[PDB]
């Protein structure tokens, strides 16, 4: 949660057959979880042999497409899956569900080190952008070269650099490359705003959010609800249903040096702005903070408003 | 048809269905698992009643249908005529 | 021998449940070895496979249908901050779904009537009062029968996780790595799946969605949910996989989370006469949803002055931010934006929308968009803005039409602002 | 030492979808504005032409069953009427780094797994699996029904490095065979680039281009969603295709299995082709389990007793547990 | 040996939509820039001419049904006011290897199959079948209603090697009979071709093209689609006709009914022409199943006596089996 003294515009990512799940209870866009999985995952394996510190994310996600088809008659959709092979015996396999998504996705990396003066910027640039072209992103493999990869070049910039003239203008130069872009953010003083306002009944805050996706028809004495925004339900973060273990304790762990314990996901509310909207753009990125001796592990933006 | 003689042990069903196929269960008012067995044979245990069922056999599957009560006719419906079509 | 005449009641049922239609050896043995626990061993008939169940409140078999691990049960959590929904929102009036094998379902049912008038099975972890209430037998066969009661909302025999039942790692902050291991929320989904049956089915909703058909529908609110998704479990054997009951066959029910733009329109920009009607205002959907949302805030008032007044800078604020999508969305497809015949709006739209300096738009194209800037572009389009609602005596005569004409004023320097960083 | 309880590789070699486009042969060097082949619909009256189950073989069931017809909507892809070449392009990336799992859970049995596997490289080199690899590029194992009686394929493969084309190659994807695994220069040279990136040595990415010339408006075979809920049987769609963005594609996951076929050391016969990596060897077209565990050449009981127990396999059955951990897998107990 | 459970052959004989433009006749030998028939619309009210029930014949209930709208949109396409041919365009590829199924559980299955059809090809060649599908294509099947009524329809089949033509023919599709399997010289030729394409030895690509004289603005039959049926008000569409990009057009497998329209051999006659070739042989028109199952002729029944049991059955239910494995289908129980 240290504020961030540059940015790093990985500039334009297809993602092939990303994770269209998010949890036990949404469907459409991947959990930020994945993308802030991803930058930490870029600090593991290049962030640290050149002296940096990547924090943030900026969701961007300029085209969306889902693998899913509604079933003819049906109002509700599924999903489109795939053969898996078959049994030991060559029967058939029991078929688990995945949805899969082709993303679009643009990346906003806060940087923290302090080797952003023993590196120019196109290297920075060009090793985090090269290293990120052999990862994956939400499960799903980060395409490379196709019919329009013109902007290939990564891009970074230091946002303290500058008049406040100079930055402010340099931050809007950064945004005629999120173009058709739409920026996620959490809006959780808002679930609790709402949860104030119709709390005469049930404060239940899942209620809250299962009435906020939604149009509201109300009758004569129709006026449907007018939305403020286009909030969505997220998932945002782990909280635990189990007292924490021993790194030995568990079997089958991914691995026996940390410890592990059995969560459950904890769900949200954000909603999708233009990057015009957005006042700055280190207000916009996604950080993970956790509570580790009680099970509070989630992420969110903070400082946005 | 030894399991139909060690009845409430699971330990020996759970041995003699672990070398054949696997385990089906039903869920309504009532509560019933199945035991299906490799040579066309099923076993439904239901806490202290049974009813051991071998396939291949008319009268077996009629009766095993009569064995289950009426909420069982809400499901199951449409596999005591998949048997009764497989013969 | 204080409150047991459910117990007693229960044995009853049981002894006439099997011996209601019996033989007369095979059923008199089995009517004999069930009544002989019906007056008080039925618990310990019960407490024989008292542990072919679980009251999961959290399972796993739900991730991978071929996972071996913990059916972790215990209550959801402690809130923490104010904006997260989860299992520790439901409290009292949970599903706790059991699971197992589903052919013992005769001792969750004896055990489920401790809360349906008692105080020792549904709250069975204090009063032992009210668990010696029926039990009436020695004290080592009593405490083995609560020993086996209070086993089946309880772990499985050791902490255990499978290599298919989805571990990850969380970063700490500045140190190492807490290992999690989430699960599926059985008993959120149950009561998720209940309120989107009374959402969208029974007889009330049903009532309100042909009484809008009606026409003149009485005062009610009911739902409608678009972009619902659908996921099964279990395959054809949905109910290997536990209590998933009539309202959900393996039939998770999926909010739309999707993007801003997840149903995309392949963007012909034509200087065409299509591209003559729509060229200086680019109508479409979200061209008309913000028309129709100008038409319902063109009766507004100004009593209203922090609600109407900041619902204004959302929707005068998110037509110039459209425009500006639009005008990027069309800006990449076309190569070069020529001067098409029946360019009304591409008079200087030809500028104002995807200027290309290519070849094609050669230095002549670059200097007359270089020099020439889109103010007629930006003047056009604060003229659109100022004619998409109408003019009468409430836009000049009040000060919510004041506020308009500021508004209008302010999100045409906006724009110009930003256009004026776009050529130069 | 047992076995880790969890094991899972990361797989190499990831493709794709792969866009058809079509145009015209002899114009094809050229080939980067063709319009795409687009999936329509059509109608279908069909008919009952099934196996009947001997009780229901009298003939008035039969002419009272064809009274109602079958009638349904499908998907087709066709080439436009003037255009005879199909166009399939996609990328190809080889990523390197093979023999390290992404997940285990024995610390002792990842080194010893890394023993093994640095063993084989130096022992032999990539350099069997990717000609191999080279070869199910070099001919057009991707195009799956597309290649059937065509006259004309010729394969283009490019490596890139930045925006630019590094090298080029232009095959002839009838010429080389289908089954046996003929050597070539160009093949060597093309099994050089993809042995260097699968030991982790470069940065290798492909860009796979293939053209067949099939004929004016025939039809193309992009491949077909795996779809289990439909509607109530009227307004249903009984074949649904594959399309990323208004073109009809191939799936990933169905160019890495045409990629992955190799295995010509099954016990049963090389002549019956080679099939797909994969463990408990298995075919779905056959239906049927090449490579049982009751026998002993699994992938299991290779890894097995090459990693634990130092029971070395023959070389062959060494390429074929090297090509396992380039497919990937999630095993375990 | 039992039959596979999964038995899958692929067509051979596979078509293109066939595509309708319309112009002049002697105008018939530069119709390559002839404009296309557009699918239209117009209005239509009709009367109650239908059947009655006994208990809607009162009169009173009929005068008021008589007086009630009954109005619907179809489609409809005409020829040009000044133009009387119409040009109907597909293509074909014939491909062979025509006893290989694509999808085969056992393989000992497989093998006596594969024995089976190679003795039929070693003592037969494809020469009947390839003489009566070549007439299919030397008149006008594909033509359904087109060809009837019309006074002059002409074929022009071009085999293409590559973008150029081989061989041209040009037949006369009324002088060519609808009943009568005769002998020529150039549809000896065109069968020796196509035989030669069954076979595996060659590559078989046709451009056929038929005009059929109609006269002016007279109404083509493009094949029709379906639509799903509601009680909309004063006239929902009650007829659609299939298109491509703005044209009129046949379905592919229309037209590859009428190429496989060469059995002569069911038990009931040979004076009633040919029927399709169908498992069970069946016309939909006529609601009728000839080769009934019972009077064993069925596909199936001799192709278990032929594969599993060795009984041979007479030469001409031969060539009705082989030419259901030319045409594909989904076999197995």
Same mark, same amino acid.
């Given at each position: ?37 991803? /930058? ?19 969701? /961007? ?16 959709? /599924? ?31 806060? &940087? ?137 304790? &568990? ?55 | ?87 | ?43 310990? %008939? ?29 209550? !959801?959590?402690?809130?923490?901050? !104010?904006?997260?929904? @989860? ?9 706790? %779904? ?40 020695? +004290? ?30 969380? !970063? ?61 479990? @279990? ?23 999707? !993007? ?18 729509? $060229? ?22 100004? $009593? ?31 190569? @070069? ?8 709006? $591409?008079? +200087? ?22 020099? %020439? ?18 003019? %009468?005596?409430?836009?000049? @005569? ?27 | ?8 590789? #990361? ?11 079509? =145009? ?129 394929? #010729? ?8 925006? #630019? ?59 077909? #969603? ?46 019956? =082709? ?60």
């Amino acid at each position: 949660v240290t504020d961030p003294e540059a940015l790093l515009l990985l500039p334009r990512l297809s993602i092939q057959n990303a994770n269209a799940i998010s949890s036990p209870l949404t469907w459409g866009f991947p959990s930020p979880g994945a993308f802030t999985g991803f /930058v930490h995952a870029l600090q593991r394996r290049v962030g640290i042999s050149l002296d940096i510190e990547l924090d943030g994310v900026g969701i /961007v996600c300029h085209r969306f497409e889902a693998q899913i088809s509604q079933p003819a008659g049906k109002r509700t959709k /599924v999903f489109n899956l795939t053969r898996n092979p078959l049994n030991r015996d060559g029967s058939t396999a029991a078929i688990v569900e995945e949805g899969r998504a082709h993303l679009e996705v643009s990346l906003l990396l806060g &940087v923290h080190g302090d080797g952003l003066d023993d590196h120019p910027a196109q290297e920075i640039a060009r090793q985090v952008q090269e290293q990120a072209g052999a990862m994956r992103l939400a499960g799903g493999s980060i395409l490379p070269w196709c019919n329009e990869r013109f902007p290939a070049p990564n891009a970074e910039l230091l946002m303290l650099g500058g008049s406040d003239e100079q930055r402010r203008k340099n931050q809007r130069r950064l945004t005629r490359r999120l173009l058709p872009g739409f920026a996620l953010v959490s809006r959780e003083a808002l679930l609790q705003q709402h949860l104030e306002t119709l709390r005469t009944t049930l404060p239940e805050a899942t209620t809250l959010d299962a009435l906020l996706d939604l149009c509201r028809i109300n009758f004569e004495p129709w006026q449907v609800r007018d939305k403020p925004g286009w909030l969505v339900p997220i998932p945002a973060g782990y909280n635990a249903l189990s007292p924490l273990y021993l790194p030995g304790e &568990v079997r089958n762990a991914r691995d026996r040096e940390t410890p592990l314990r059995f969560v459950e996901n904890l769900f949200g509310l954000g909603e999708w702005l233009s990057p015009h909207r957005v006042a700055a753009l280190s207000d916009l990125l996604w950080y993970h903070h956790a509570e580790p001796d009680k099970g509070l592990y989630r992420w969110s933006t903070p400082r946005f408003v | 048809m030894i399991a139909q003689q060690h009845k409430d042990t699971v330990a020996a069903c759970e041995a003699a269905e672990a070398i054949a196929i696997a385990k089906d269960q039903v869920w309504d008012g009532e509560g019933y698992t199945k035991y299906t067995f490799d040579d066309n044979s099923v076993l439904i245990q239901s806490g202290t009643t049974q009813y051991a069922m071998d396939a291949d056999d008319a009268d077996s599957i009629k009766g095993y249908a009569d064995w289950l009560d009426d909420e069982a006719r809400s499901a199951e419906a449409s596999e005591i005529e998949r048997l009764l079509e497989s013969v | 021998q204080e409150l047991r005449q459910f117990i007693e009641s229960f044995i009853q049922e049981r002894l006439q449940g099997k011996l209601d239609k019996l033989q007369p050896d095979e059923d008199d043995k089995r009517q004999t070895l069930l009544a002989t626990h019906r007056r008080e061993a039925w618990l310990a %008939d019960a407490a024989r496979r008292v542990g072919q169940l679980q009251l999961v409140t959290h399972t796993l078999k739900p991730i991978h249908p071929d996972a071996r691990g913990s059916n972790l049960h215990s209550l !959801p959590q402690a809130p923490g901050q !104010p904006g997260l929904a @989860g299992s520790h929102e439901l409290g009292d009036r949970l599903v706790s %779904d059991v699971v197992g094998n589903a052919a013992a379902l005769d001792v969750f049912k004896f055990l489920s009537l401790q809360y349906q008038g008692k105080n020792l099975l549904n709250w069975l972890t204090e009063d032992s009062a009210e668990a010696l209430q029926a039990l009436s037998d020695n +004290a080592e066969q009593a405490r083995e029968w609560r020993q086996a009661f209070i086993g089946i909302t309880t772990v499985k025999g050791a902490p255990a996780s499978h290599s298919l039942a989805k571990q990850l790692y969380f !970063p700490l902050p500045g140190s190492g790595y807490h290992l999690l291991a989430p699960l599926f929320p059985t008993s959120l989904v149950h009561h998720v799946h209940a309120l989107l049956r009374e959402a969208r089915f029974g007889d009330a909703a049903k009532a309100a969605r042909e009484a809008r058909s009606r026409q003149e529908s009485w005062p009610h609110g009911f739902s409608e949910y678009p972009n619902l998704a659908i996921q099964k479990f @279990g395959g054809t054997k949905p109910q290997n996989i536990s209590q998933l009951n009539n309202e959900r066959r393996g039939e998770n029910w999926l909010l739309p989370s999707l !993007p801003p733009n997840w149903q995309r329109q392949n963007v012909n920009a034509p200087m065409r006469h299509s591209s003559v009607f729509e $060229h200086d205002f680019g109508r479409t959907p979200e061209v008309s949803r913000l028309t129709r949302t100008l038409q319902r805030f063109l009766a507004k008032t100004v $009593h209203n002055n922090l609600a109407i007044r900041q619902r204004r800078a959302q929707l005068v604020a998110q037509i110039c931010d459209e425009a500006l999508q639009y005008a990027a969305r069309l800006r990449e497809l076309e190569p @070069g934006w020529s001067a098409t015949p029946g360019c009304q709006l $591409h008079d +200087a739209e030809q500028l104002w929308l995807d200027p290309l300096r290519a070849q094609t738009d050669e230095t002549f194209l670059q200097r007359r968009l270089r020099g %020439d800037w889109p103010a007629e572009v930006g003047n056009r389009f604060a003229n659109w803005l100022n004619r998409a609602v109408s003019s %009468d005596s409430q836009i000049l @005569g009040s000060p919510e039409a004041a506020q308009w004409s500021q508004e209008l004023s302010k999100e045409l320097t906006m724009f110009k602002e930003i256009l004026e960083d776009e050529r130069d | 030492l047992s076995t880790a309880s969890v094991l899972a590789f #990361e797989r190499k070699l990831d493709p794709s979808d792969a866009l058809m486009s079509a =145009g015209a042969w002899a114009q094809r060097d050229a080939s980067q504005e063709w319009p795409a082949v687009t999936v329509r619909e059509k109608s279908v009256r069909g008919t009952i032409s099934n196996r009947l189950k001997t009780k229901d073989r009298d003939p008035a069931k039969l002419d009272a069953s064809i009274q109602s017809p079958n009638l349904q909507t499908v998907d087709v892809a066709n080439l436009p009427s003037d255009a005879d070449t199909l166009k399939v392009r996609f990328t190809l990336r080889v990523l390197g780094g093979a023999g390290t799992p992404s997940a285990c859970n024995d610390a002792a049995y990842r080194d010893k797994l890394l023993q093994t596997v640095a063993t084989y490289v130096n022992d032999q080199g990539f350099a069997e699996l990717a000609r191999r690899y080279a070869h199910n590029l070099a001919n057009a194992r991707f195009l799956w029904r597309n290649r059937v009686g065509a006259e004309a394929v #010729e394969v283009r493969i490019n490596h890139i490095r930045q925006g #630019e084309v590094a090298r080029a190659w232009r095959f002839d994807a009838l010429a080389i065979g289908l089954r046996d695994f003929k050597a070539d220069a160009e093949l060597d040279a093309l099994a050089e680039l993809i042995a260097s990136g699968l030991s982790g040595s470069g940065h290798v990415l492909l860009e796979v281009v293939a053209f067949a010339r099939i004929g004016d408006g025939q039809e193309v075979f992009p491949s077909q #969603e795996l779809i289990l809920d439909k509607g109530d049987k009227k307004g249903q769609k009984s074949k649904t295709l594959y399309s990323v963005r208004d073109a009809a594609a191939i799936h990933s996951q169905k160019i890495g299995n045409a990629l992955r076929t190799i295995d010509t050391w099954y016990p049963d016969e090389d002549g019956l =082709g080679p099939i797909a990596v994969e463990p408990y060897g298995s075919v779905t077209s056959q239906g049927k389990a090449y490579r049982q565990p009751k026998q002993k050449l699994d992938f299991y009981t290779l890894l097995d007793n090459w990693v634990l127990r130092d029971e070395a396999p023959a070389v062959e059955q060494q390429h074929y547990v090297i090509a396992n951990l380039i497919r990937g897998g999630v095993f375990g107990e």
